[PDB]
Amino acid sequence: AAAAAGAAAAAATAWGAAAAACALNIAAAAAAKGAQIENKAGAAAANPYLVLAATVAAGLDGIQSAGAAAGAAAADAAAAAPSEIPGKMEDALAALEQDAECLKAGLGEAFIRAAVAAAKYELENEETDAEGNKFLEYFI
Amino acid sequence: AAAAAGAAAAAATAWGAAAAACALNIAAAAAAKGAQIENKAGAAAANPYLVLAATVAAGLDGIQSAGAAAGAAAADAAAAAPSEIPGKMEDALAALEQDAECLKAGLGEAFIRAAVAAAKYELENEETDAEGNKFLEYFI
Amino acid sequence: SAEHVLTMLNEHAAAFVRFEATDAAGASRSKSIPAQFFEKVIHARGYLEDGEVNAGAAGAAASDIVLMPELSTAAVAAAAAAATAAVICDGGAAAAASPRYIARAALAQLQAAGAAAGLLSAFIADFCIFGVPEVINSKTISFPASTTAAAADQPQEAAAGGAAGAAAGAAGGAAAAGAAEICFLPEAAGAAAADNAFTLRTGLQEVARRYNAIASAAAAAAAAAAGAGSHSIWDVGAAGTNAFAGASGARATLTGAKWLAGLLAAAAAAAAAAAAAAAAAAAAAAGAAAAAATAWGAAAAACALNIAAAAAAKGAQIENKAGAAAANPYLVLAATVAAGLDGIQSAGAAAGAAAADAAAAAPSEIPGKMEDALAALEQDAECLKAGLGEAFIRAAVAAAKYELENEETDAEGNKFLEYFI
Numbered sequence: 001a002a003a004a005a006g007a008a009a010a011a012a013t014a015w016g017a018a019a020a021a022c023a024l025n026i027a028a029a030a031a032a033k034g035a036q037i038e039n040k041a042g043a044a045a046a047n048p049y050l051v052l053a054a055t056v057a058a059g060l061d062g063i064q065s066a067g068a069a070a071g072a073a074a075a076d077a078a079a080a081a082p083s084e085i086p087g088k089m090e091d092a093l094a095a096l097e098q099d100a101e102c103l104k105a106g107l108g109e110a111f112i113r114a115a116v117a118a119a120k121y122e123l124e125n126e127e128t129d130a131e132g133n134k135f136l137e138y139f140i
Numbered sequence: 141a142a143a144a145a146g147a148a149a150a151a152a153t154a155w156g157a158a159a160a161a162c163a164l165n166i167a168a169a170a171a172a173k174g175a176q177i178e179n180k181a182g183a184a185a186a187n188p189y190l191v192l193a194a195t196v197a198a199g200l201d202g203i204q205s206a207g208a209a210a211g212a213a214a215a216d217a218a219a220a221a222p223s224e225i226p227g228k229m230e231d232a233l234a235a236l237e238q239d240a241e242c243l244k245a246g247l248g249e250a251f252i253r254a255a256v257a258a259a260k261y262e263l264e265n266e267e268t269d270a271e272g273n274k275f276l277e278y279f280i
Numbered sequence: 281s282a283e284h285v286l287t288m289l290n291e292h293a294a295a296f297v298r299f300e301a302t303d304a305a306g307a308s309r310s311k312s313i314p315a316q317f318f319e320k321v322i323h324a325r326g327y328l329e330d331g332e333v334n335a336g337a338a339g340a341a342a343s344d345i346v347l348m349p350e351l352s353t354a355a356v357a358a359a360a361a362a363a364t365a366a367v368i369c370d371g372g373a374a375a376a377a378s379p380r381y382i383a384r385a386a387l388a389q390l391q392a393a394g395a396a397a398g399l400l401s402a403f404i405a406d407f408c409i410f411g412v413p414e415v416i417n418s419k420t421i422s423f424p425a426s427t428t429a430a431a432a433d434q435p436q437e438a439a440a441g442g443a444a445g446a447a448a449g450a451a452g453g454a455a456a457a458g459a460a461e462i463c464f465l466p467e468a469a470g471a472a473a474a475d476n477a478f479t480l481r482t483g484l485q486e487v488a489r490r491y492n493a494i495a496s497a498a499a500a501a502a503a504a505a506a507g508a509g510s511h512s513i514w515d516v517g518a519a520g521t522n523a524f525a526g527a528s529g530a531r532a533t534l535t536g537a538k539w540l541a542g543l544l545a546a547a548a549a550a551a552a553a554a555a556a557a558a559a560a561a562a563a564a565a566a567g568a569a570a571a572a573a574t575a576w577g578a579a580a581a582a583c584a585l586n587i588a589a590a591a592a593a594k595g596a597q598i599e600n601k602a603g604a605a606a607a608n609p610y611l612v613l614a615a616t617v618a619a620g621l622d623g624i625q626s627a628g629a630a631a632g633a634a635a636a637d638a639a640a641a642a643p644s645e646i647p648g649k650m651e652d653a654l655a656a657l658e659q660d661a662e663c664l665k666a667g668l669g670e671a672f673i674r675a676a677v678a679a680a681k682y683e684l685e686n687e688e689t690d691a692e693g694n695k696f697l698e699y700f701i
Contacts, residue, residue, distance in 0.1 A: 118569065121637060123277060127275070135264055
């Protein structure tokens with residue numbers, strides 16, 4: 001809802017130093033030590049440790065694909081890049097299975113599936129008994 | 141609840157002509173044409189056509205097993221016969237699968253399973269999708 | 281030391297002293313007097329009282345029973361509004377309904393059998409906390425209700441300065457502090473949940489009340505969430521060393537496997553103390569983290585009798601889960617030991633360790649009828665309800681039964697006439 005359309009929104013996945021709505025500003029400075037970037041694609045409902053992980057995981061493989069950010073935004077408040085983009089969940093899943101390297105980089109998840117399996121066994125034991133009763137209630 | 145314990149209950153599965161609580165009285169009469177029996181093992185919440193069927197289905201095979209009603213009740217309000225009896229659902233199911241001939245005699249049921257299958261296919265399609273979601277919610 | 285209890289009255293300027301005990305259901309109880317009454321006689325004769333105040337402790341022709349305070353267990357009652365002390369007691373005349381004296385018989389039997397010289401257990405029991413509980417029943421309605429500042433239901437509600445926006449979630453509030461606190465930390469108490477359970481059970485409530493809240497031990501205090509379990513760890517020793525350490529599975533040993541065999545066999549009857557209320561049966565119901573699976577292992581987390589594996593052999597122990605905080609501590613401490621004390625004499629075995637899916641292997645036991653549960657109670661029968669009577673119970677209960685049967689036989693006499701008309 002905070003990322004929805006408006007004159008000061010930040011959903012425009014673009015970079016620049018004057019187009020204030022673009023998600024990835026350059027923090028220009030007089031001292032070279034202060035030349036940095038400025039990210040806007042989020043809100044305080046987030047998880048700090050997982051944002052700090054995920055934003056770095058993207059940068060850590062952009063330097064290995066040797067990809068490019070296209071030209072800087074200096075026109076009207078949204079477009080150039082935006083783009084990305086294909087307009088379907090099937091293509092979002094295709095991206096997740098082709099790159100896939102700027103995304104969810106390293107580790108598992110072995111601890112998650114081990115703990116979640118114990119909960120799933122109890123849930124599936126209750127659900128399979130309920131489904132067993134429901135099937136009889138459909139055959140009558 | 142109507143068949144529960146009390147001084148005028150009718151759950152005593154027995155026969156006679158003076159023990160008023162016994163479920164199967166003899167309707168004694170001066171004219172031989174009026175010699176009949178008197179059944180008490182039910183209440184007006186029943187289905188008339190299915191009671192009329194089931195009570196006859198019992199009599200229709202008692203004449204083929206050549207079984208006997210034991211001695212008439214003339215003692216205190218309950219016992220002799222009661223009996224039957226074994227005190228478990230497993231033995232009630234064993235009786236349903238050994239006699240089985242005084243019970244649910246003839247027909248099917250082909251019409252019931254044909255109509256109920258159409259309802260069961262819709263119910264199982266909704267339930268298997270719900271179980272599919274529940275299994276994922278147990279694996280996390 | 282009688283001398284130490286007497287000098288504590290001067291050292292802490294105690295104006296009064298509190299005698300303390302526990303009932304058969306599992307709740308602590310207390311009474312008090314001025315400190316000036318303490319003399320050499322009570323150290324050998326206790327305090328005589330009329331037992332007719334309790335419907336299972338005396339009778340009208342025997343209206344004299346004894347509370348017996350002890351002289352190694354005194355403490356300052358620091359939660360009180362005045363300078364006072366507290367002392368736990370046994371009960372006697374007699375007697376054999378005092379849970380602490382019943383628990384001491386299991387410790388005496390452990391030593392008298394020559395199997396070991398002591399028992400080295402501890403507990404990790406959970407609890408609940410609230411601000412406004414409301415629970416009532418009548419001829420026309422029945423409902424429980426409760427709430428707390430951490431509850432997942434509060435962030436949608438208004439408050440006198442707005443909501444904090446910081447509540448927990450369903451099975452998602454594992455952020456509380458410890459050791460919860462002043463009934464274990466300043467005493468460095470360490471020892472088993474026999475005597476130590478009741479300072480914790482009163483302390484949790486008293487500290488919550490002094491912070492405008494309340495605390496409880498209800499095993500299933502809310503649906504679709506965690507509850508007040510009473511999980512523990514268990515061990516045996518003599519001559520200064522552990523007796524469950526060895527070279528079988530998860531660093532256990534053969535006498536440990538025989539204690540486990542006793543515990544597995546007794547689980548269907550140990551539940552009468554460890555799960556003493558319907559809330560504990562609800563906590564033991566089916567789910568992904570239930571503990572009703574009467575089995576042993578070191579990885580199958582749902583199994584009731586884990587092995588507490590450790591790098592030091594002195595720390596090789598077992599971990600029991602078959603109960604909740606609605607239990608009676610002294611009778612759990614007695615019953616769980618009574619099972620182990622005869623598993624070593626039947627020389628039974630715990631079968632193979634559980635490492636498969638969350639329930640089965642052993643479970644088993646098992647026959648599926650009350651008649652077979654009663655048959656087990658009359659064939660073994662030796663891991664269960666071991667030693668004592670009960671002579672004190674039947675003597676006090678007979679006095680109550682004579683009054684009840686005199687009222688009931690007159691009522692039945694009237695009812696028979698009302699059936700003959």
